[PDB]
Each structure stands twice: as C-alpha cells, then as structure tokens.
C-alpha cells in the first residue's frame, strides 16, 4: 500500500475517523485472544462518546464504498431517507428484502465452522500465559550491544523518576527474572543493589528483524540535510550549489544563515539540529563559530556551534566543506572519525549520502563496562 493523498480537512477526515477491530469482512475471523475479544466491544461503544450518536458510519470518512442496506432507522443526525417502510425481518410486505446473507448465499460473513467451545465458564487465564520473562530476554538478546544499552539506559532514565523506593525494588525483582546484567546495570543509576541471579527463565536464544539500526536504509529519499552558512562572503553561493546537488539524490535541503537572503531557507534563530537527518557546514561559514560571529543579535549565542554539537552528539552524519574543518575542531571532532566527513564538496556529499544509509553512528555512545 502506498499513501499518496493528504486530507483536505484534518477534522472531517483524520480526527473523525473511527477504527474498530470489529470492522471485519468475509474471509477473516477472530480468535479466542482475551485481549482481542474485549476490543470488539470497546471500539464500537467508545464511538458513542466521541461522535455523540449511533450514525458515525454515515460520516464521509467512515462510509463504505460497498453500500449499506439494512433495517436500522432513526438515530441522531440521520443523513439518509429510507424508502422501505417495512423495516423488520421476516416480512411478507418487503417481499424478502433486504435479504439474509451467509456462507452459501449472498457472500455473507460466517464464523469458522470448525470452531468450538469446551469447558467450564471461567474468570481465569490459561496457564500457557504464565511465562512473562522468556520473550523479553529473547528480544533483548536479539539487539545490537548499543541498542541493548539504549533499552537499559532508557529504563535508567524512566525508573529514576519513580519517587517510591520500594517500587524501584519491585522493578529490580522483575528485571532480574529476565536478565541479571540488565538488573545490575539499571540498579547502578537507581543507586540500589542487584538481587541474586535467577536461572529459571535465563537463555541465549535469538530471532531476526527485531532490530532497527543494525541494517541500512533502502533509500535516503526525503531525508533532510541542514546547510549551516552565512550571509557575507562566498559561503552562500557555494551552499546554493550544494543544495541543488543534494536534492537530486532525493534529499530535502535547508539553507541556514543569519537572515533570509536570496538562497536562505531558514534562519539560525529558527533552526535546530533535531529538524535534520544530517548537518553540513558550508565553506566560509566558519565565521559564525567563533569570535564576534558566534554572538549576533540575529540569533541566540552559540547557536550554529550548538547545532553542530547537537548533530554530532546525536549520532548524525556531520560534515565540513574544505576550510570548514575548523568548525568541527572547534568542538573536538576529528575528520578521521566515523560519520564525520571533511574535504571537497563532492567528497563530502558522497560520504554523507553513504552516512544517511547508516543513519545513526553508534560509536558515539558509551556502553557499560569501561
């Protein structure tokens, strides 16, 4: 599936749309997943709240393309007028229409015939559901070492915000049942002590496709490069030429400067590293990285220096064009490094576009033990 159209009104289309798992057709059926079973009730019921009426599938974005024929009448905000005045089944007076459809006639929906119900009526869950630790380990084991650090570092950040000491202890108990290393590593940040190992659910099994960074992107199209430049000297024209070249590969390039000159897409005040997939300093733009240049009324002090610092420290491809290397060495970044490119314009582009395929450079993040 390819998404080629934008909404015309956000509210009418995006906001008012009502998804349900119970929106099912012939050739599909549910299973006895206790989570799924409840969703079927919930999604239909909650529309009464959002839409204030039972006629929310009469809304243009909820209308089917297949046609609606039944004996449902009235309702709040009824948009249709119904021709059939015999709105009940079975009737002599409607002459059998709307007709009843099933497996054999009318291509109607049907539950799977092989399905059965066996046992006592219970408010319980199957014992096959009681292994809560094996698959999270399976997931963790299947992650690259840096990605593993991210998950642990994420838990360190999150569980740090918990103000109840005992709850944090309770987290460690559950974390420990999965992996002691994780329990050890987290307990450092929380300033607590790792419990004794539990070999019950521990294992080293692995499966594929659960990782994000370890593979390279199929395409770098639409990704954004930010060209840090300046309004005075020769930086702008070089930058403009850099722009057209980059767009051809599929990228979207934003030319940043002190103010909105001829080729300037964005200002330094309105720019930040988060808006870009890669940052590249144009040549002669070094003037704004130190001295009076870094302190202008046109932007907060240290802004260009921060964007470069931010972009590098966040794992993004960083670049300098020719003489621009002083900017990268202003913050302590050597061109020899991985994900950092300095040299001629064509040399840098080729490096950057390759880097975008890498997308994120995990060498720039510290891993436990060291």
User: Residues 5 to 34: which contact its own copies by CB under 8 A?
Assistant: 6-14, 16, 22-26, 30, 32, 34
- Asked if 49 touches its own copies (CB under 8 A), the answer is yes
45/193 with CB nearer ligand HEM: 45
Q: What is the DSSP string of 122-134?
A: -S---GGG---SH
- Which stretch of DSSP H or E encloses residue 345? helix 345-358
Structure tokens at 76: 């709040």
- Asked if 3 touches its own copies (CB under 8 A), the answer is no
Closest by CA to 317, choosing from 229, 237, 223, is: 223
65 preceded by cis ω (within 30°)? Answer: no
- For residue 22, the partner it binds in ligand HEM, its own copies, none, with Cβ less than 5 to 8 A by kind, is its own copies
Q: How far apart are CA 193 and CA 180, in angstroms?
A: 11
28/35 with CB nearer ligand HEM: 35
Query: Least CB distance from residue 269 to ligand HEM, whole Å?
Result: 30
Of residues 35 through 94, those in contact with ligand HEM by CB under 6 A are 35, 38-39, 42-43, 46-47, 50
- For residue 329, the partner it binds in ligand HEM, its own copies, none, with Cβ less than 5 to 8 A by kind, is none
Among 212, 221, 241, 260, interactor with its own copies by CB under 8 A:
260
Q: What is the DSSP string of 156-225?
A: HHHHHT---HHHHHHHHHHHHHH-HHHHHHHHHHHT--PPPP--SS------SS--STTS--S--TT-EE
Gaps in the chain following residue numbers (C to N > 2.5 A): none
- Asked if 290 touches its own copies (CB under 8 A), the answer is no
Site residue total, ligand HEM (CB under 6 A):
11
201 is an annotated ligand-binding site residue: no
- For residue 19, the partner it binds in ligand HEM, its own copies, none, with Cβ less than 5 to 8 A by kind, is ligand HEM
Whether 286 contacts 240, CB under 8 Å: no
Among 2, 130, 136, 161, interactor with its own copies by CB under 8 A:
161
Query: Least CB distance from residue 154 to its own copies, whole Å?
Result: 9
Phi, psi of 187 (to 5 degrees): -60, -20
Structure tokens at 292: 């009076």
Whether 216 contacts 195, CB under 8 Å: no
Among 4, 111, 196, 204, interactor with its own copies by CB under 8 A:
111
- Asked if 346 touches its own copies (CB under 8 A), the answer is no
Q: Helix 345-358 crosses helix 235-248 at what angle (to 10 degrees)?
A: 50
- Asked if 51 touches its own copies (CB under 8 A), the answer is yes
Termini Cα distance of the chain = 46
Of residues 19 through 38, those in contact with ligand HEM by CB under 6 A are 19, 35, 38
Residues that bind ligand HEM (CB under 6 A): 17-19, 35, 38-39, 42-43, 46-47, 50
Residues annotated within the binding site are: 43
């Amino acid at each position: 599936m390819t998404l080629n159209r934008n909404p015309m009104n956000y509210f009418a289309e995006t906001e008012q749309i009502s998804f349900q798992p119970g929106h099912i057709v012939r050739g599909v059926d549910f299973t006895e997943d206790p989570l799924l079973q409840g969703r079927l009730y919930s999604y239909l019921d909650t529309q009464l709240n959002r839409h204030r009426g039972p006629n929310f599938e009469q809304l243009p974005i909820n209308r089917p393309v297949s046609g609606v024929h039944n004996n449902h009448r009235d309702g709040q905000g009824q948009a249709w007028i119904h021709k059939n005045i015999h709105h009940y089944s079975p009737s002599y007076l409607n002459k059998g229409y709307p007709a009843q459809a099933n497996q054999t006639v009318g291509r109607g929906f049907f539950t799977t015939p092989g399905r059965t119900a066996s046992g006592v009526l219970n408010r319980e869950l199957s014992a096959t559901f009681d292994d809560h630790y094996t698959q999270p380990r399976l997931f963790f084991n299947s992650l690259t070492p840096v990605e593993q650090q991210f998950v642990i570092n994420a838990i360190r950040f999150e569980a740090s915000h918990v103000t109840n000491e005992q709850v944090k202890k309770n987290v460690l108990e559950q974390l420990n049942k999965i992996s002691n290393d994780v329990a050890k590593r987290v307990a450092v940040a929380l300033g607590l002590e790792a419990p004794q190992p539990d070999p019950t659910y521990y294992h080293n099994n692995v499966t594929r496709g659960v990782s994000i960074f370890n593979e390279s992107l199929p395409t770098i199209a639409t990704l954004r490069v930010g060209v840090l430049s300046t309004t005075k000297g020769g930086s702008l024209d070089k930058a403009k030429a850099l722009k057209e070249q980059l767009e051809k590969d599929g990228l979207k390039v934003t030319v940043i400067a002190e103010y909105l000159a001829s080729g300037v897409d964005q200002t330094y005040s309105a720019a930040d590293a988060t808006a870009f997939d890669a940052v590249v300093v144009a040549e002669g733009a070094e003037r704004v990285f130190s001295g009076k240049g870094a302190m202008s009324p046109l932007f907060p002090a240290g802004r260009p220096s921060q964007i470069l610092t931010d972009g590098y420290r966040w794992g993004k491809p960083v670049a300098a064009v020719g003489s621009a290397k002083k900017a990268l060495q202003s913050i302590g970044v050597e061109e020899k490094e991985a994900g950092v490119y300095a040299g001629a314009q064509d040399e840098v582009i080729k490096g950057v576009e390759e880097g975008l395929k890498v997308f994120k450079f995990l060498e720039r993040f510290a891993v436990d033990g060291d």
